[PDB]
Every structure is written in structure tokens, then in C-alpha cells.
Amino acid sequence: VSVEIEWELQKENSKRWNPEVQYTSNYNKSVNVEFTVDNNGVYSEPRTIGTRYLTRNL
Amino acid sequence: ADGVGNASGNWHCDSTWLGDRVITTSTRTWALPTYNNHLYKQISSQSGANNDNHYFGYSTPWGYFDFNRFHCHFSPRDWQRLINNNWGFRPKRLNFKLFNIQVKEVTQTDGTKTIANNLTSTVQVFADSEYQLPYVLGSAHQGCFPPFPADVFMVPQYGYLTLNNGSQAMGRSSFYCLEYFPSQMLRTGNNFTFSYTFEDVPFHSSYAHSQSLDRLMNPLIDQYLYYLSKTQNGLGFSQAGHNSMRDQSRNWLPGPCFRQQRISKTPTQNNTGDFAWTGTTRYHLNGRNSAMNPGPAMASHKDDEERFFPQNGVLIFGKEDAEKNNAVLDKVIITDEEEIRTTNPVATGEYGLVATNFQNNTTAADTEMVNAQGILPGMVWQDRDVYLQGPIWAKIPHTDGHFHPSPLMGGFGLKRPPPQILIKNTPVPADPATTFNPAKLASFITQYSTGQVSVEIEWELQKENSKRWNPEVQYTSNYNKSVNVEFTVDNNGVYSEPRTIGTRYLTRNL
Amino acid sequence: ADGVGNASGNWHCDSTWLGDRVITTSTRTWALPTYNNHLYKQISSQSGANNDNHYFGYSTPWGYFDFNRFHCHFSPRDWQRLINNNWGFRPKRLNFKLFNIQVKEVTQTDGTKTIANNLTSTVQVFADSEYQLPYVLGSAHQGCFPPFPADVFMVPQYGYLTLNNGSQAMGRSSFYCLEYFPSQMLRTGNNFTFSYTFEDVPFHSSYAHSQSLDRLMNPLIDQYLYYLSKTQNGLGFSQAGHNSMRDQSRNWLPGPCFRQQRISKTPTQNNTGDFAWTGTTRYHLNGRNSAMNPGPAMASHKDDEERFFPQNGVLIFGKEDAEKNNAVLDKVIITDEEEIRTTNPVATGEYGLVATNFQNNTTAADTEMVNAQGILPGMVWQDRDVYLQGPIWAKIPHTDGHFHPSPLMGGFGLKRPPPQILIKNTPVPADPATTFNPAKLASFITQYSTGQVSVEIEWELQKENSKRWNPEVQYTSNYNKSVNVEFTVDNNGVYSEPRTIGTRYLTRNL
Amino acid sequence: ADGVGNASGNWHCDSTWLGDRVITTSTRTWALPTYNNHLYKQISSQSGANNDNHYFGYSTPWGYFDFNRFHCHFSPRDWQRLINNNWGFRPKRLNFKLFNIQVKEVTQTDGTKTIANNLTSTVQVFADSEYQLPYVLGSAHQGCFPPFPADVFMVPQYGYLTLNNGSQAMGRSSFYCLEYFPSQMLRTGNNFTFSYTFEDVPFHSSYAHSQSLDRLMNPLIDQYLYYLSKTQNGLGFSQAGHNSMRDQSRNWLPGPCFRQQRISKTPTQNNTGDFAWTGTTRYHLNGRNSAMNPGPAMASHKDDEERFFPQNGVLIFGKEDAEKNNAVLDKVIITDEEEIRTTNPVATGEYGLVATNFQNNTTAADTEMVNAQGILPGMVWQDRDVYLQGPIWAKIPHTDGHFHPSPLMGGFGLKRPPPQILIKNTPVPADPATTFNPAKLASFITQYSTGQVSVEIEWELQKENSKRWNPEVQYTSNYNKSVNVEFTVDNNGVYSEPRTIGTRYLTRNL
């Protein structure tokens, strides 16, 4: 079974000077890589990821 | 843009009444200092402040122009023409111009100040037309064009707030550098012009209802519907009619309310303790309390109660000589929303009574007051009135949802309001050292600027088509003699606005 | 070029992101003194100087404009947009403008300074577009456009060096008179514009490898090739596989290295003597020693050694309040090249081990460390990263030969770089004597100039096409509360860059 | 794509010699199991492994096709035709086809296996043409097309490595899901075709020099230049000539070298200890040591030393019956690079001698050996030879810099090499439960697939234009009688490649 979805995007036009908060992987070493399979082939989603990172004025 | 000896604009101050439109034009003289000694600064509340009062933000070297009050554009006579003859009005478009720029340099010397023209200095100006900066118009700040066209005013300094946690900042807090925008640079020969079109908005309602929501029926005829008129010794049902209007079935409901405390203009009728804060109605947001002022549109008092007003529920203006802090009642002017008592609950009362239990042979029927009531289907209401000295528009916050976005201080809610116009004196360094120093320059020539500014607004009018036989109420000057004439200068040249003037005089049926 | 009362340019400071391009525009206010009291001067080192430090050259009355750092053109947010989303970028073209020229005269008088406009004075400017002058951009000097657009800066003085023998000069030493060039002369109404196109250069690599050069094989499958796995009691040969990756045959070699001394950020782990000079790696040229700083691109430390850094092998920036001399470790920011450890040797280790003898029945096999290794066929390497506060380009020396001319401090090597832009206040003599004197005039009116300068650069971007499933590392602000916001002004108006920001976040396979 | 009873391709195995081109075509029969029971798995080294051997990566359910050895495409006779007649060759283009797909299902039952056709099952295949996956071809792994066209081979399993720190992973480590690519799905009637064009690459040099770099002069004539021929009792200078060739001035230098240990094929001439690891030349990368095998192209031995070979410096192939671990010398075939001794240093010697001090009246002149020497201007060298059983191409790592990217195991360096072709049996679930279970399905029908695969490569040839009078050396079979014929099957049907065959037979001047 296949499903294709087209999504429309709204770009960011901010004049903010300082850097934004951004979703990032941890750069440090670890036993497993987040959002991958383990040694037994089980895929896992370690954490939830929302959408709200960039900012906007009221 | 010609040069030193040629004026770059003329004085346009006028009002033109054309049919279903009125065009106001206003010109004033302004003066702009150097703010913050050219620097941006982080600003925040002190450690000892109440949590409700903490903040974090920045002050900028820029100034900005604010024409967001009705008396910037309408003379008192013009306002009278508007409100006595029209059921509604709204803004349509505007033009803005900055001209006759003059830059001055000030030198302290030994004992006295010396002022001279700096012919080669520039001022910078830009309009934030993409709404990329925090929008501080619409907070009812001072610094507008003065109501009397001969008065000269100081341009206010621009600053803004961002996310705070106590007195500190959060990672998502934003810092804006206004030099990171394109801006026009003006020498004394140059000028700046901007034009803008208002988005469609509904007419402000300048009228009062001549009917109340609970008396919309024909007083001569009974209803065909029945209500429960008797419980004692068995149920009984009756058709309501002219002798019981409180019992008739109806199609609509009064508007929402959030009840406020009741203050008396008679001093002996008030409690003598300190309830100024504890008596206010407040909203709780991220651990901080804010007064809900003025809050939802609600009538100020009911019939024959005109001595009372809601504690935080009405706009209050100062008289010309009023102090900034702890002015007495006689020095302020309290607006009165009584005209909306036909559709809106009184601000200091309950919405109504709701049933709380199940009545039976052994249990009486119980009710309790509802002091805060949100929207219900079938509700109708009027928004707060606008005033000659009150605000005009506000920016609707950019959010997923809002409901009926009429700004609660009154006026027109706009998604894309008139843009902020920012202005700054370009810094002119004093003589630098003759050996290279990498530090940023800290030594500047003392300067300020002055010029004229004009704004033209086209307003659309909604005419009155009433069949009312008897004369209307109308706003009028008093015809009797007096020591001064209202809305004029006194013997010392001080202009004053003696009273507030709303818009609701003509009437309309529900 | 119109005249006194008309601005000759506008403030353009913006960034525009279009598809595979980003256009930065930067404007600043500058001030230029008179340098050297209008004179050219021979300058040289003192007799007592160390031979390594001798020099001979000239200082000129001219100043020059330097925009050769990334933070001149990119706000911190813009830099974030760049590095989180793109695998590479390079400059394409630029425009330069000098405008709103103001010339001031200063008079000492009796007790206080007086400053006035000199409307008829001129400033001279020219771009050395034929590269006829010594090119001093690209030496990482101070005096650039400040990173924060509201700061005002002093234009640095131009000087240069030529051949020296000790403190003396050689017959082939060159002297350049900058008045022997054509230059434009500007009064307060005039402006100057220059445009330039960058030569084709490879994209900077803004990415880290997600593989290391020694792990490029399929871990599931053995090699068909054999290696010598056993010498004891006779030779034996094996096919390497997942359990011995150190033995597999490979196609490529790590990049070159020149080993440097290892410094610890933990104070007690360092020797307490004076090795600051004697510990550095140096090159010997015409009898003079120069530190090799930063030297070849090499990784700063290996895994889990992040407390160590190479003595002369990394760029080091000061914090805002750092002293010029002998600042402590906590006052500086040390860059970290660890991302290139996948292809490049660690700066503080050996390249490897080489065989030194012939083994036999009576003689064991011997090896020794190779601490300096030049290029070999089959080597691959990454160049040093670029930083928000680091340099952009350098002029490739004009020579018969060079190899891989990526400037070692980082950035883009250019045969024909952006030309030097030279500027000077034209001398205005004071009143001469009324009897002819042939001596050159020594008495001048004290003057300085100020104005605005703008530079626009178009950058080409290389997009990321990765099939990586899991999320990338990304540069981010901290989300927690803090007393100040990073990369902003403080309560006194001082802008500061708290940390260095490299370009290597996204990943790519080898 | 017609259906069950129609073949989807024909057997194409041929070689066509046309002028300056040769087209090889190769077809084989393959079999593909289910790998990893359909799962992706994280794989890593054990805790007890040597740091040099740690790794982190993933094994995938996919297989892949590898034709990256010369004997996949050239019969031994064809290779002879190539090397005896041509000075060079390079690949130009290729076509790939997968066809006659058959999917089988296996059932265990009670005592014996049962195999049947699954007519509706599919296999998935795609070519990674954008180079988005780790490229594991070019590591000399097993699993290629077998050299003898009648042999049937198992498709090898695809896996890859990413960044490791010890046995753990780093944030920048990448995970790739191959189902996140588009792929063609084939039932038994379907086929797959792919075509590719090689990028321009230089011809492999199939020739040996008939001159050595140190004898390029005219032996009959003296030089006009002088050298220092006498120091004793005063300096003296002479013109070099035929009797002193070691003293003549020359224009060029031998190629670079990194010296390796010397192993004897005579067992008693070797040390009896364990130097297998400690004797190797190694590079040090991010704390890990890797043998430099084969390393820079260097001649295996000097004249009359043919019993010696460099420890880690030559390709070594197994004889047909060689063990995987600790095979004795008689069971392996050691390649010999002696033909490049004309321009390249011998692998087991020094590059030369360098001066270390300043000679004077009291101090003798000193030199020392240089055992590792990088590139110098004026160097020339030959790259390593290619072999009938050796690799063809390798992917040049994607990096800022590389030098002379000829892969060190031999063959053609390619920025955009022939893409990896990945293939997998689509999983077919067994009967699921009749009540919904959200867990992923763990129970599958046991299947494998088989089919034919073809690859056609067009090669460009560089002809020989020599004026040499005397006959060349040529690769030849032995003409004498023998029990078996070289490069054939034996009485049991085992094909074997008895010896390695290089390309360098014809000669050319320097």
C-alpha cells in the first residue's frame, strides 16, 4: 500500500537578531542512536517531537 | 529634496466633508532628541518587584510617531458633526509625510548653551510595513500628536518587551536591531512619504438603541406559548401577556459579562480600607496576575444609579491639570457606557440565576448567581464606545484563534494596522584620536532634530435613515455664559479638553 | 552628487534568502582622522629587537576599509540559517558604496574644543583594482566593520612592509606613494561606488563526515586479499574481516600533518616553566623563525580528550572584556576542529610509524614515529572550518608554485581578491606667510571626516540532499532562562559574541 | 515483462574487439537468501576488542551486486590479448541487466525440505545513482561475479559503518533505511535494466619503462655543468661524464615513499618472533592505528633481490585451496611491482640521504637516511599495476582536498563510480491471527530467489607505436606438457587461477 501527500509550507520572515531554538540530536556518544533500530531489529521512538521552535511576535 | 533654502512641504490642516466621506488632515511640529546616547540597552524589572510586575526587554535609540487617538484628527466641532449626524464610521486610507527637516547641534562651551544648524547631518526613517517589530501602538501610551494644532511635541522613545521569567530572559526571547532594516536617510532638503489602505472592518456603531432586548414584543397581544405559572397545589400553565412581560418566551440573550466591584462617587459610601488591588477583577497568566481593565463591554450602571461605576471597568482620562499619581476624583473624567444597558449586562451585577439542584416533595428549588458568563448561542451585545480623546485602532494578535476581535479599550481591530514609523538622528562622531583604536566610538556631537509631520485619513460614513417623529438627543455646547469657552485655550495659552465626548446620540431600533 | 542639503545615500542593512542564493547587505557609520599629520614615514624595528622580530617598512597618511570577517555580513540568526540548512557556500559578487560624506574642522582656541563643518573640504578614495599595492587584508587585523550594526568605528591606518635585512633595507625594497594613483575627490555632496565579481572558487564544506576514512568497508564480508598475520614459527597469511579491521587493505590515506605540542585546559596538567616560545612549531625563513600558526588543518584532539588543544594550532578569539596582553584562559574562546578527525590526523599526535631497518634471524623489526609528513598520492583531507567571527578570504601570493591554496586561517583563497579601498582627508593648509618660502607647508587645519559605508555580497548555496533517517545535529540557542540573551547588548549597551560558531553541523558520507 | 512462461532475457557472454575498443559482456546465475530474517540490526564490536578494531554500524536485509574485479569481465585469453598489444586502457560505459527472476518458497514439514515456485512473490531492486548510501564497493570484498562463467554465486549482504567512539556511536552517526528509497518490484515476468557512463579518467599504464630515471643522459658526451669533485687539500670542480654518472646534474626526482619492513621468501632468513603487527607501517587516525596496506606505489625489491617482499606493501591473493586463516606461503600468490623500479623507490629501502649539520675545519659532514618522503616539485612516479584478479575502480572520497587520487590498491579513481545495485526479497507474511494485534508481524514464509545478471562494459584502448628493433617481453603460457592446463577446471570441476597476471609487458621510453 502506498500513500503520497502534498503539504504546503509557510516560510519564516523574521528580523530576530539572535539565534533561534532548534530541535537537535545530542552530539555526545551513546550506546544507541536515537530513532533507529537496536541490535535485535526493534525500531523505537525515544522522545516526542513537537512543532514549536521558531518564534514570532504577537 | 531640492536643498537648503527650499521648503520640502506645506502646512496641511483641514477637514473636508464630502457626501458619505470625511477627510481629515493634521500637521504638527515635532522635536527628536538623541535617545540612550545612541545605544541599545537591556532593561528589566528590579529583583524586589512583585512577580506580577516583572519584565525583560530592550530600549532602543529610535523614536516613533503615534497618531492613534481620535483628537489627533478631529477638531471638537468636527467630532460633533460626526456624532450628531451619522450612525457609523470607519477608516479607509491614510497618507503620511515627514518634511522640513532641521538638524541642530548643541555646544556647552564655558557657561551657556549654543545652538547651530548642522546642514550636513541626517535623520533616518522607515515604516515597518511587514510587521517585523513588536507593535507597541495600541497600548494607549502617551506621546501622540497633541489635540491642539499649535502645540509642539516631543517624539517618544521606542522600546519593547519579550519573554521573561521573573527578571530574567528565556532562550526564545527575541532581540531586534532596528539598524538591520533598510531606512531612508534625510538631510534638510529631503522628505519622506508613506501611504496605506485600511483592511475592511465593520462600522463603529455610533447610535444607541431605542429599545431594550427584553422589550421587543407587541404589548397589545398575548403569546400563544404557555409557561409554568403555578406550582402551589398543583401545576398550572398560562399564556404570558402585557401584564407579565418577565414571563414571556424570547429569542435572544444579553451579552457576556465578568462581574466587577462597584465604586461610589459619593465618598462616604465606600469602604475605607485598601481594596485598590484586592477589589479588581484579574486574569492569571503564567503565574502573573493582571487587572482586567476595562474588560468586556458592560454597562456602567443601571437606571438611577449614575453615582456608581465599575472599579476597573471604564476608561478614565485626566483633566488638564491632573497629577500623574493619586489624582483625586475631581481631577479625572470617568467615561460612562450606560447607553449599552439595552443589550449588555451592567458591569457590577450578576448575569443571572441558574438552577443548582433537583426540587421534590421534600426539597425546595435552589438557584445561585452567575457572576461570570461566557458566550452562548443567541447572545447579542454592543462593543464599547469610542471617545474624542480615546484610541482608534489596535493590532489583532497573531494567533490560531480569537473571538470577536474588537479591542477592549474600544475602536477598530486590525490584522494589518497602520505600520509603526521609526525615526532616529544619525550619530555624528566627535574628533577621533589620531592613532588607531579598535574600540567603538563613544564620543559624539550633541544633536537634535525638528520638523513637521502630516497625516491625512479618509473616513467612510454611514448615514441615518430614521422614521422617528420626535427630536433626537444631540451633543451640544452649553448656551449660558461662562468664564471660559469649552475646548479652547485659557489666558495662559493652555488648551484643555474639559469633558469626554462619546459617539452615541442618535437612536436605532433593535 | 547633488549638494549640501541632499543625502547621497540610504541605509541598507538586510539579508534576502532566495533559493540557492543569499544576499547580505551591511551599512555602518565610520570616522577617519588625519593620520601621520599628513606625512609618509619610514618605520623599522629597534636595534635591540630579536632577529625574528626585525622589520622595515612605511606608514602612510591613508586609511582603508576592511569587511573581511563573516560577522560583518551575517547576523547570528542568519549564520544559523546558513549552517543548519546547507552543505556549502561561496561568495559570488559584491557592491561597495561610500556616501553621506561630512568633513569637520576642529579648533583648540583657549580652553575648549570647537567643531564645525568645513563644507568645501574633500576626502579622496580609490580602489586598488590592479593589485599594485602591498595587500594587507588577509592578515587578520583589527579594524573591520563591527558586528553590531549600530556601532560606529574608526577607519584603520594603512601601512606596509618590504624587504628587510635586520632593521635595514635592501636595494630591492619598494616604496609606494599612494598619491601616485588616480583617486576620486569627494565633497559633502559626492559619493563613490565600486562593484566586483569573485573568481570561481570551490564551496566551503559546511558539513561533517558521518564516516571515518578507516571504516569505509562492509562489516559483514571478508576481503579476498591476504595480509601477513603470523611470523612466529613460520609465515602465515589471512584474509581480513570484521574482527580485524586494523589489518584490512585500503585505498586511501589520511591527510598531511606537522605535529604540535599539547596544552591542557586543566591547569595542573601543564608544565610550569616557560615553553610559550620554545614549545611552538616554527618555520625557518632567511634566518628568521616564525611560529606556524595555525598551520596545517589538523583535528584538535582525539575522542574523549576534549580538554587538550594544540599549542599554536587553533584560532583563538577574545571575549568582549578580554585584555590585549596575557588574558587568562577564561577570557578567550578556543575554536575546536574535532569534526575533521575522520580524515585528518590529530594535531598533537604522530602521522604514523615507518620501518627503519632490515629484520632477520638475529635482528628484530624496528619502527619510529613520523611527526611531520608531507603529501602522498592517495591522501584526502578537509580544510579548516570558517567561523562567524573568523576571516573570509585571503590573497594567494603571486608565485611560480603553490599547492592547494586554501588559506590556513580558513576561508577562500583568491588570486584576484576584493581590492583594497583607500581613503584620506585632503590636507587643507593654514594661512601661509605673506613672503614666499620654498619649504613644504607644515601647518594645516585640524580636520576629520565621517560618513556611511555599505557593502552587499551575493553568496551561492549548496543544498543538502541526504537520505539520513535519524535527526541531524543543529546549532541551537539554549532554551533555559538566563540573565542575558546570547549575542545581544547588556544593560550598558555593549554587544558581545559569547561563543564561536563554526559551520559543520549537517553530515555527509565519505 | 510478459509473464510466467516467457523468458525475460538471453544469455550474453562475449568479447568483441573493434579497433581501439573492446566490449566485454558477462552473464552469471545468482541466488539471494533472506538476510537478517527481514530485519535491520545495529552491529558493533565487542567490549574486549582492541581499540584499533572497534566499530559501530548496521546490517541490512538487502543484498548487492559486485562486479568490481577484472576477471569478472575478461577471460584469461582476453586479458592476454589486452596486455600484450596495448599501452593502456580505460572503461567508457556499461549496461546492467537483471532478468529471469524466479522466487521459491521452502517448507520444512516433518522430515524433509520441500521447494516450490511462488509465482506471485516479488524482488525489489534499485541503483543508488545519487550516491546517497555508504559506498562499500572498492574495499576488495568477496562476493563478486565468479571468474568462470558456469559458476553460480550467492549475492552478498549489504551493511555499513558510521562514526564510532569505541563501541558506541556519536550524535552525528547516520542510520539509513533502504526502504526509504524508490525501488522497482519484479515478479517472475519482469526485468530491470540500468546504463551508466564513466567519467573521463586517465588510461592505466600497461607498459614498463625501458629506461631508468637516473640514466636519461647521452653516455657519449660530458656535461657543461660542474660539480664539487674534490674537497681534500682544497676544493676542486669537475664536469661529469660517462665515467661518473652518479655525479651528473639532473632534472627530475624519484617518486615518494614510506619505508616498509622486508620479508624473505626463504624461511631461515626471517626473525622467529612475532612481528606481524609490530613490523607493519601504520597510520594513526583519531586514536586508532591502521596498517598502511599496500600503501604508496613502491617497487617490491631491487635487482637480484627477488626473494624479498615488503611486509604490508603488495597485494596477495590466495590459491584455490588456500585457507582463510594462517595459510602458508606456498598457498598464496604474491604480486610483484618490480617493473616500476625505474621511477619509484624500492619499498623496503630509504628514499635517500639528507645533510644534518654544518661542516667546518673541526667538524665532519653528516647525513642521515630519509625513510619517509612526501612529494617534491620535479618528482615523477608510476601508480601500482592492475591484475586479472584485482580490483577495477574505487570511489574517491568526497573531501575538500586530495592528491593524485589513484586508489592505492590499484585501478581507476572515480568521483561518480558505477552505482551500488541493491536487491531484496519482499517479505511475505505467514497467516496472521484472526484478532487484531498491533505488533509488527514476526512470522514469514521462507523464501529465496534466483536469476541471471548481465554486465556489458566498453573499454577504450591505447595502441603501441614503438620503434624498438628487438622483440618485446610477452605474457605466455608454458609450451611444455603438464598434468593440467593453466586457468581451467580440474577433474572435479574446480576452476582455478594458478598465477596472477599484471599488465606491464610492452615497453616505452621515459
Residue numbers in the entry:
A (entry chain x): 669 to 726
B (entry chain S), C (entry chain A), D (entry chain c): 217 to 726
Sentences from the paper on this structure:
The AAV capsid is comprised of a total of 60 VP monomers. All AAV capsids exhibit T = 1 icosahedral symmetry, but only the shared C-terminal VP3 region has been resolved, while the extended N-termini of VP1 and VP2 are intrinsically disordered.
For AAVpo.1 and AAVpo.6 capsid structures were generated from 512,823 and 539,729 particles, resulting in final maps with resolutions of 1.79 and 1.77 Å, respectively. The amino acid sequence could be readily built to the density maps, starting from amino acid 198 for AAVpo.1 and 217 for AAVpo.6 which is comparable to all previous AAV capsid structures. On the other hand, AAVpo.6 is more similar to AAV9, with 98% aligned residues; however, significant differences such as in VR-IV, where AAVpo.6 has a 7-amino-acid deletion, resulted in an overall Cα-RMSD of >1 Å. The AAVpo.6 demonstrated an even larger preference for galactose binding, roughly 3-fold higher in Lec-2 as opposed to Pro-5 cells. AAVpo.6 shares four of these residues except for N470, which is substituted to serine (S460), whereas only N272 and Y446 are conserved in AAVpo. In contrast, AAVpo.6 shares many amino acids around the 2-fold depression. The equivalent residues in the AAVpo.6 capsid are K481, D552, and N696, explaining why the 2-fold antibodies did not recognize the capsid. AAVpo.6 crosses the BBB in pigs, a trait of significant interest for gene therapy.
